[PDB]
Design a protein around this ligand. Structure first.
Ligand code: CLA
Ligand code: CLA
Ligand code: CLA
Ligand code: CLA
Ligand code: CLA
Ligand code: CLA
Ligand code: CLA
Ligand code: CLA
Ligand SMILES: CC1=CCCC(C)(C)[C@H]1/C=C/C(C)=C/C=C/C(C)=C/C=C/C=C(C)/C=C/C=C(C)/C=C/C1=C(C)CCCC1(C)C
Ligand SMILES: CC1=CCCC(C)(C)[C@H]1/C=C/C(C)=C/C=C/C(C)=C/C=C/C=C(C)/C=C/C=C(C)/C=C/C1=C(C)CCCC1(C)C
Ligand SMILES: CC1=C(C/C=C(\C)CCC[C@H](C)CCC[C@H](C)CCCC(C)C)C(=O)c2ccccc2C1=O
Lengths: 161, 162, 107, 732, 34, 139, 51
């Protein structure tokens, strides 16, 4: 398929991975009696292993010659659920954390003693700020354009060189 | 360094002269000595089992120093130990290799020292210059003509040695 | 000691993956990491890290996100203490993982 | 009291520091007392001739020791089976088992087997016998003498070059491009066409017959008619046995591409045509600059006029001409950055495109040559940034460089350094996190859960050059393409054969392990650059020490005040980045060597499955390949890998000894030494002997250098012992 | 090997006499005042 | 003014931390002070000694050793009567501290400023400017 | 006389050529070589230390 890879649902090496992974657990299950707590635990592990391989086979992942799933991250939309979409979820959460922390340090600067607000956090105000993060791309872009994100170069301390 | 009689000085000229006269004697003596086979077991190759890895040479045949070469080297080691003891602890009267820093360098001989037939310094310097030149003459003659240095020593003197 | 003790007996930690001793293989690698990470604190000095922090403080100032508790490089003594603590943790954890996977497998 | 004759400050030091510092500052001629600029450039010129001669004596030595003690004539008969001999061993510490164990190579004496590849290089360029290796050794001894006499001669009062000569940028560039680069590449084509090509085809050509033996049967008549394609007619057949007349063609200039099918090296007619092309190009490039006849460019005029009108570079390159010429450190930094990139190109292109016959089947030589040149590359690149820092401290004048590219680089120094900090952190967090994710999941018995990311961008690049493995069908990989059609009549048939065949290191197959390690190398190159760039940009000052320039390049600290200023100098960022250089060339050479030994077994999939987690690197590369190396001696005997077995431990010792200088610092050691001074003065029969120089502990900067040297030497000796012994012991 | 005597003659000289002599001279030069 | 060599010394049972051959061949330092009591102090070179009531004399190998005792005697026993001398092997006695009878921390007339630079530290010349010329970097 | 006398024994008894019949000659030569190195050390110390 893509990059000479094979879909995991029809690769024989993924199937032998699943079969070997289940044989390892079945030989551990072969030393226990049916209703015992270790046997029940081992059987649930076998069920989880089968579910993982069954889900991966039908997911559109591409396996290598080694039978392990490979991620295609060049931007193609048939594989966007492996990096582009998880990455968009990350950048939303990361920008949330960044916007929320930036808003709290700007609040803490306007305090009576700014450095106590950073070792003893004003938790109601900081929770107001953690609620602010859900619309950070718009809040931060309006902040950027309204001249409130970027400070001018002549307001920043720099070394003599 | 140079202020102790070392370098291109007449002290060094005299000392290298003494060593070259002795060296001409030693070369003549070893030519006569191995011409008659008076070095015992001259071809016998020393074994690493007795002497260790210093005896190895890597010549394709034998892989070891010969007994002759070891014997000439031991003769040289005898006079080297004499040399070190004479250099560091000289005799009261002997000329010393390293002169005291504040010394009077002897005047250079010139093109030719004055000729004195006795056991004089001038005679020593003349013979010494001749012997140092002689060492170069034999070493070049042997090198140029592809002959052993022992053989060219024998050839120059008309095969009197052997 | 290198061959017949460390190399020969580190077989169990290196080959522990997929077994119950795979935690020891993970702690073996993690402690090699922590030990090496300590040498960042041990071979370096505070002045490098304070000037690097100055450039990072500039990037925060540019976005108006400088903290009011001014970031500093750790003290010279604390850089030594952090290096020693990570070195001891890394070395001892490496030996702990190696000893325990080796002797659980073979003894 | 007079050893550092170039330094009165050291020559009046009563301690042992005087000896160390006089030895360590000896080559920093700019800092010597009463140093003018005339004398500085003339001593550098003469000592450059001494380096020239040392290189020639080193090469004459390699040729002499192979002509004398090697098995070159036995090796050239059967180059795939005979192991090349570097030189013989005469070691009086050897046992008789050691003497027997090193007596390989088909000779009767112990020997070192050469990993330098000089046999393959001398075979390829024409040398056949010991007499011509010896003749080369003699010629290099003559050239070494010629350049030693030139070094002495250009120190004589009438022959002393002036500063106007040393800074003639245009004449030096014209001559180095057209004579040193171009004409010597053209002369190297002549050597290949006249000597190496006929002797690769069985016909001996030496000084005895080369004016009466034509390289081509037609012979300089097609060249002087424009019938140049007659020099490509009848190339060497695919049946050619290198060194012999069977299968040989008559062509002397081709563009076949790929590799000679037997030697698995580039065609020598391709190499002769390469140096002819690159020679003419460089010769043309050496007519660029105006010297005495009114045509050409002034470098001053070019630099002054390259300011973009948008104003984004400020004053642009106004004043950069003067800064470069006046600053030997700026020149050294440009030269070393340029050279470091080239020796990295040398390492990358000589394993993928080998030029020497029957190398790339000498796996030890390929591993040693790649590792050697990548370590030289890391040293040159770190030194380039070091001398950029030395340039900023010592030679950079801000008034002469107002609003230039250089001033504006310093103006945003914090944007540059903080974005290098970001990209270093970005790569490090994720690459390590993906590696640790893979390790944890594989450990937990779930290798499928591993985040394996295909190197699609690089695979697309491979496919664009004709690799059909990934099925991209891009450019050369697609048969019906403009790019493919264009090169079809010239180099594409050979190149496609070479790239698609899996018997060579050309565009080796890349998978998830390759992606992860490349990102690790990106973190390493960015982090070494961060440390070096932070050192260069903050060399002249910082908020912690604004007047850092006034203290120099290498000073210990500014004391415990202002929080603590250890490792605050620009030299100390050299020092810290030297570890990161060693770490990155470690990652590069570990990757190269593991990928190649797995391919050389026929087990490339073992790298493909184990390189994606770090325990695969630990068990399957370091632990698995240690076994021939650490069994070089044991209680059951020893073999010829004993020397590498001893060197490997020796490297571990030096490396660990470096930790003593890097972890333990001066005050402890000065307090030890003062108790030893007391003990020596109070011991009877021993206080008769007195030091002339007061024993002191090493300085702060000196011990950082000593620990860095020990760390680095241990790093090199350990890896050289491993990369040579594991490859030798395995042979694959 | 041709000139097999030379490794036995030179390696001890270069490896023991050369350093000893140059160390001795280097020691004298570094310690000396005038 | 000159050092009275006959001043009695503090009662010290000796130590290995005292001065070595460089004191008798390069320079030795002496410190004298008047004590109102027979009291124990700590030597800079080791353990404890007892300073005698009246005038005491010490022989140290360093001026910092002398000034360390001077601070210990001024902060714990309040002696401000300390004079620090450098004694050459020639027998010359060089008075050092306080150099003009008044402590360095107190202003005194007739002191000429040495090392004083008329501008601030950021106005120092760049090293490239002072390269290959004898001109100093302090302007 | 003291130092040269006791130097021979460790070189003779524990040297590389100890098991050989030339052990004493090797031990004496090794002692003598050490004497020559040490006498060089004494000479160079004397040259630099004392005016
Ligand atoms: C380092 C080189 C590089 C870079 C930066 C990119 C970057 C990108 N690629 Mg490309 N790609 C590359 C190499 C590269 N690719 C290679 C080597 C291949 C193998 C042939 C591909 C094959 C590939 C395919 C097949 C596709 C991409 C697409 C994309 C885009 C992803 C989503 C996006 O922004 O769409 C724009 C969407 C928005 C701006 C908003 C959407 C919400 C992005 C611009 C996709 C695309 O959109 O093409 C333009 C796509 O379909 N890439
Ligand atoms: C949420 C607060 C916050 C914000 C907005 C930023 C913003 C920035 N940092 Mg980060 N930083 C922070 C906290 C923060 N910093 C802390 C606490 C540390 C100490 C660990 C650092 C250490 C740090 C370094 C070492 C570097 C940055 C860099 C950067 C810049 C690049 C963005 C980036 O990749 O972040 C990267 C962020 C990190 C590497 C660390 C993340 C730390 C955590 C996740 C955030 C802390 C959350 C905080 C407690 C929120 C509390 C608020 C709550 C009470 C409401 C940008 C100016 C980089 C730079 O200069 O490039 C231009 C860079 O090199 N920062
Ligand atoms: C060490 C002193 C010494 C002695 C005892 C001799 C003795 C002799 N030499 Mg002479 N010779 C000497 C030094 C000496 N040489 C030197 C220094 C050289 C220069 C290298 C030569 C070069 C020389 C040649 C070229 C020849 C002799 C030959 C001879 C022998 C027979 C003919 C003759 O009387 O030649 C006359 C004497 C002399 C020429 C020199 C006196 C004779 C016994 C001949 C011989 O038989 O050699 C095989 C002969 O052809 N000699
Ligand atoms: C044609 C005229 C000419 C030529 C040939 C040279 C040649 C040289 N000059 Mg120059 N010079 C010239 C005119 C010339 N000069 C003029 C006119 C001036 C005055 C304006 C100067 C002023 C000058 C100065 C001031 C200095 C030199 C120096 C040098 C030497 C450079 C050091 C070196 O080994 O680099 C050799 C470089 C190459 C062989 C080319 C590099 C090849 C690149 C890096 C990669 C190629 C790799 C390739 C595959 C090689 C493979 C080898 C094999 C193992 C595979 C070199 C011998 C320097 C020196 O060392 O002094 C002696 C120096 O300081 N020159
Ligand atoms: C791509 C880069 C580049 C650029 C923009 C220029 C631009 C120019 N060159 Mg240069 N030149 C170049 C590369 C370049 N050259 C190279 C690679 C060489 C080596 C073959 C030369 C060698 C060269 C010479 C020898 C001369 C020029 C000259 C000129 C000017 C010719 C104007 C003209 O033809 O009038 C219509 C012009 C400023 C002439 C001039 O006056 O230089 C300033 C001149 O005499 N060029
Ligand atoms: C394994 C060894 C190791 C590791 C991991 C590092 C890691 C790093 N070095 Mg250091 N360094 C080392 C050895 C090491 N170094 C040595 C031996 C030297 C020689 C003295 C140096 C010298 C050196 C210098 C001079 C510089 C670095 C820099 C860096 C950074 C480069 C990677 C980066 O920017 O982000 C990668 C980040 C990481 C790898 C951090 C790991 C993330 C952690 C582990 C998260 C874990 C959280 C977890 C819950 C913690 C549990 C704690 C528990 C008590 C609760 C990073 C902090 C540079 C830097 O700071 O650039 C910004 C820099 O300037 N290093
Ligand atoms: C610079 C390159 C170089 C190197 C590293 C070596 C290395 C070695 N040589 Mg030498 N050799 C060289 C060039 C070199 N050779 C050349 C050009 C010749 C031809 C004259 C020889 C002729 C030669 C002989 C005849 C013998 C050796 C031997 C040896 C080995 C023992 C050391 C010894 O006895 O040296 C003795 C070497 C010499 C007397 C010749 C001088 C060597 C070069 C020219 C000196 C150059 C020094 C360098 C450029 C810079 C010096 C300063 C440096 C300290 C910073 C050792 C493997 C011995 C051997 O093979 O044992 C196994 C031996 O018997 N070599
Ligand atoms: C690099 C060159 C080199 C060479 C050629 C040698 C040569 C030798 N070593 Mg080695 N050695 C070296 C470096 C070297 N050493 C280094 C760097 C170290 C420190 C790691 C050692 C440590 C070492 C030990 C610990 C021992 C040797 C021994 C030996 C001897 C071999 C065993 C044998 O057959 O006993 C026969 C040996 C002899 C009969 C001794 C001969 C004495 C010589 C000929 C007198 C020379 C006078 C002296 C050099 C004057 C120099 C003054 C100065 C100004 C130069 C042999 C003399 C063994 C030894 O001493 O042998 C007893 C031994 O026990 N070596
Ligand atoms: C780092 C260094 C320092 C300072 C700066 C620098 C100069 C630029 C640099 C260079 C260093 C360099 C370039 C160092 C170069 C060092 C070299 C080239 C050393 C060569 C030594 C050769 C010897 C001793 C051979 C002697 C042969 C003999 C006696 C044979 C004689 C004979 C035989 C038997 C046969 C023929 C007859 C006779 C005559 C009898
Ligand atoms: C610190 C310091 C202070 C001041 C002084 C100082 C010494 C100067 C400085 C040092 C600076 C230093 C040490 C600087 C180091 C600088 C370095 C190492 C720069 C590397 C440059 C490489 C480039 C631009 C490669 C370009 C390849 C291309 C375009 C390939 C193109 C392609 C081709 C043709 C073929 C394939 C297809 C594609 C991909 C299209
Ligand atoms: C990296 C480094 C720094 C910078 C390191 C800093 C500023 C530490 C900051 C790390 C973050 C901010 C907190 C660390 C939290 C860790 C994830 C876990 C910490 C566990 C305990 C602290 C609770 C120094 O300041 C330093 C000083 C002297 C010698 C060497 C070094 C040195 O190596």
């Amino acid at each position: 398929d893509v990059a000479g890879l094979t879909p995991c649902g029809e690769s024989k090496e993924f199937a032998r991975r699943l079969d070997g992974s289940v044989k390892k657990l079945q030989t551990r299950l072969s030393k226990y009696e049916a209703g015992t707590p270790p046997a029940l635990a081992l059987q649930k592990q076998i069920d989880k292993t089968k579910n993982r391989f069954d889900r991966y086979g039908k997911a559109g992942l591409l396996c290598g010659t080694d039978g392990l799933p490979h991620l295609i991250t060049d931007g193609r939309w048939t594989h966007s659920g492996e990096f582009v979409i998880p990455g968009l979820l990350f950048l939303y959460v990361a920008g949330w954390i960044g916007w929320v922390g930036r808003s709290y340090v700007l609040f803490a600067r306007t305090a009576d003693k700014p450095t106590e607000k950073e070792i003893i956090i004003d938790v109601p105000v900081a929770l107001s700020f953690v609620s602010t993060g859900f619309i950070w791309p718009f809040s931060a872009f309006k902040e950027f354009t309204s001249g409130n994100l970027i400070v001018p170069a002549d307001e920043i301390t720099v070394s003599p060189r | 360094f140079g202020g102790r009689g070392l370098g291109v000085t007449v002290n060094a000229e005299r000392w290298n002269g003494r060593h070259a006269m002795f060296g001409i004697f030693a070369m003549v003596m070893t030519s006569y000595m191995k011409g008659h086979g008076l070095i015992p077991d001259a071809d016998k190759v020393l074994d690493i089992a007795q002497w260790g890895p210093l005896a190895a040479v890597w010549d394709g045949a034998g892989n070891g120093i010969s007994n002759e070469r070891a014997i000439i080297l031991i003769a040289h080691v005898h006079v080297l130990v004499v040399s070190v003891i004479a250099a560091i602890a000289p005799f009261g009267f002997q000329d010393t290799l390293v002169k005291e820093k504040g010394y009077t360098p002897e005047s250079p001989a010139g093109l030719i020292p004055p000729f004195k037939t006795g056991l004089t310094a001038e005679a020593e310097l003349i013979n010494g210059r001749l012997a140092m030149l002689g060492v170069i003459s034999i070493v070049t003659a042997s090198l140029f003509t592809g002959t052993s240095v022992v053989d060219t020593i024998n050839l120059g003197m008309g095969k009197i040695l052997y | 000691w290198l061959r017949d003790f460390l190399w020969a007996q580190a077989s169990q930690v290196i080959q522990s993956y997929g077994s119950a001793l795979s935690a020891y293989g993970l702690i073996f690698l993690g402690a090699h990491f922590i030990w090496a990470f300590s040498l960042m604190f041990l071979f370096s000095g505070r002045g490098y890290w304070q000037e690097l922090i100055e450039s990072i403080v500039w990037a925060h100032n540019k976005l108006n996100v400088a903290p009011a508790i001014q970031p500093r490089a750790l003290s010279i003594t604390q850089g030594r203490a952090v290096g020693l603590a990570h070195y001891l943790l890394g070395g001892i954890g490496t030996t702990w993982a190696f000893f325990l996977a080796r002797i659980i497998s073979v003894g | 009291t007079k050893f550092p004759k170039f330094s009165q400050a050291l020559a009046q030091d009563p301690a042992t520091r005087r000896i160390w510092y006089g030895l360590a500052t000896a080559h920093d001629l700019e800092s010597h007392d009463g140093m003018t600029e005339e004398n500085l450039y003339q001593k550098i010129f003469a000592s450059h001739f001494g380096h020239l001669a040392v290189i020639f004596l080193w090469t004459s030595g390699n040729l002499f020791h192979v002509a004398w003690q090697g098995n070159f004539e036995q090796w050239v008969l059967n180059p795939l089976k005979v192991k090349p001999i570097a030189h013989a061993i005469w070691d009086p510490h050897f046992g008789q088992p050691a003497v027997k164990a090193f007596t390989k190579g088909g000779v009767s004496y112990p020997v070192n087997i050469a990993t330098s590849g000089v046999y393959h290089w001398w075979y390829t360029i024409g040398m056949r016998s010991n007499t011509d290796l010896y003749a080369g050794s003699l010629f290099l001894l003559f050239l070494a003498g010629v350049f030693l006499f030139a070094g002495w001669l250009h120190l004589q009062p009438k022959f002393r070059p002036g500063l106007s000569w040393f800074k003639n940028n245009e004449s030096r560039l014209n001559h180095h491009l057209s004579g040193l680069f171009g004409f010597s590449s053209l002369a190297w084509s002549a050597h290949l066409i006249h000597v190496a090509i006929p002797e690769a085809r069985g016909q001996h050509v030496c000084w005895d017959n080369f004016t009466k033996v034509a390289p081509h049967p037609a012979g300089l008549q097609p060249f002087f008619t424009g019938n140049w394609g007659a020099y490509a007619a009848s190339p060497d057949t695919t049946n050619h046995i290198f060194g012999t007349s069977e299968g040989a063609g008559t062509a002397i200039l081709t563009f076949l591409g790929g590799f000679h099918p037997q030697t698995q090296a580039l065609w020598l007619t391709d190499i002769a045509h390469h140096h002819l092309a690159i020679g003419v190009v460089f010769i043309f490039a050496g007519h660029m600059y105006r010297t005495n006849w009114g045509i050409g460019h002034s470098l001053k005029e070019i630099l002054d006029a390259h300011r973009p009108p948008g104003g984004r570079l400020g004053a642009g390159h106004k004043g950069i001409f003067e800064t470069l010429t006046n600053s030997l450190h700026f020149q050294l930094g440009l030269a070393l950055a340029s050279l470091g990139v080239i020796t990295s190109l040398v390492a990358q292109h000589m394993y993928a495109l080998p030029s020497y016959a029957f190398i790339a089947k000498d796996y030890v030589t390929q591993s040693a040559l790649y590792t050697h040149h990548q370590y030289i590359a890391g040293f040159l690149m770190v030194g380039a940034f070091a001398h950029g820092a030395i340039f900023f401290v010592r030679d950079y004048d801000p008034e002469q460089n107002k609003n230039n590219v250089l001033a504006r680089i310093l103006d945003h120094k914090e944007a540059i350094i903080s974005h290098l900090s970001w990209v270093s952190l970005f790569l490090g967090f994720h690459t390590l996190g993906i590696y640790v994710h893979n390790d944890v999941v594989v450990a937990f018995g779930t290798p499928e859960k591993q985040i394996l990311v295909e190197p699609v961008f690089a695979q697309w690049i491979q496919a664009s050059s004709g690799k059909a493995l990934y099925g991209f069908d891009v450019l050369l990989s697609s048969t019906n393409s403009v790019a493919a059609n264009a090169s079809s009549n010239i180099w594409l048939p050979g190149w496609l054969e070479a790239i698609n065949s899996g018997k060579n290191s050309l565009f080796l197959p890349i998978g998830p392990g390759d992606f992860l390690i490349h990102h690790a190398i990106a973190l390493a190159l960015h982090t070494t650059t961060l440390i070096l760039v932070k050192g260069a940009l903050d060399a002249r000052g910082s908020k912690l020490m604004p007047d850092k320039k006034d203290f120099g390049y290498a000073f210990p600290c500014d004391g415990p005040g202002r929080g603590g200023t250890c490792d605050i100098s620009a030299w100390d960022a050299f020092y810290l980045s030297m570890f990161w250089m060693l770490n990155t060339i470690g990652w590069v050479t570990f990757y190269w060597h593991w990928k190649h030994i797995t391919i050389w077994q026929g087990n490339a999939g073992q790298f493909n499955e184990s390189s994606t987690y770090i325990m695969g690197w630990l068990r399957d590369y370091l632990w698995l390949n240690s076994s021939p190396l650490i069994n070089g001696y044991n209680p059951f005997g020893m073999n010829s890998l004993s020397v590498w077995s001893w060197m490997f431990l020796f490297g571990h010792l030096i490396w660990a000894t470096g930790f003593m200088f890097l972890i333990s610092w001066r005050g402890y050691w000065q307090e030890l030494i003062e108790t030893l001074v007391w003990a020596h003065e109070r011991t009877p029969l021993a206080n008769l002997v007195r030091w002339k120089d007061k024993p002191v502990a090493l300085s702060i900067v000196q011990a950082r250098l000593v620990g860095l040297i020990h760390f680095t030497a241990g790093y090199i000796f350990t890896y050289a012992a491993f990369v040579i012994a594991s490859t030798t012991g395995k042979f694959g | 090997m041709t000139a097999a005597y030379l490794p036995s003659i030179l390696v001890p000289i270069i490896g023991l006499i050369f350093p000893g002599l140059v160390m001795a001279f280097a020691f004298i030069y570094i310690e000396q005042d005038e | 003014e000159t050092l009275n060599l006959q001043i009695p010394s503090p009662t010290f049972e000796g130590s290995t931390g005292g001065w070595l051959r460089a004191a008798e061949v390069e320079e030795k330092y002496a410190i004298t002070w008047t004590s109102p009591k027979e009291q124990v102090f700590e030597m800079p070179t080791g353990g404890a000694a007892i300073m005698r009531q009246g005038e005491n004399l010490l022989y140290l190998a360093r001026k910092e050793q002398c000034l360390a005792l001077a601070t210990q005697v001024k902060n714990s026993f309040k002696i401000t009567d300390y004079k620090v001398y450098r004694i050459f092997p020639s027998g010359e006695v060089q008075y050092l501290h306080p150099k003009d009878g008044v402590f360095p921390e107190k202003v005194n007339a007739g002191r000429v400023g040495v090392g004083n630079v008329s501008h601030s530290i950021g106005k120092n010349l760049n090293p490239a400017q002072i390269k290959f010329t004898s001109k100093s970097f302090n302007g | 006389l003291t130092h040269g006398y006791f130097l021979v024994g460790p070189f003779y008894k524990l040297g590389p050529l100890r098991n050989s019949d030339v052990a004493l000659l090797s031990g004496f030569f090794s002692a003598l070589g050490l004497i020559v190195i040490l006498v060089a050390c004494l000479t160079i110390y004397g040259v630099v230390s004392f005016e």
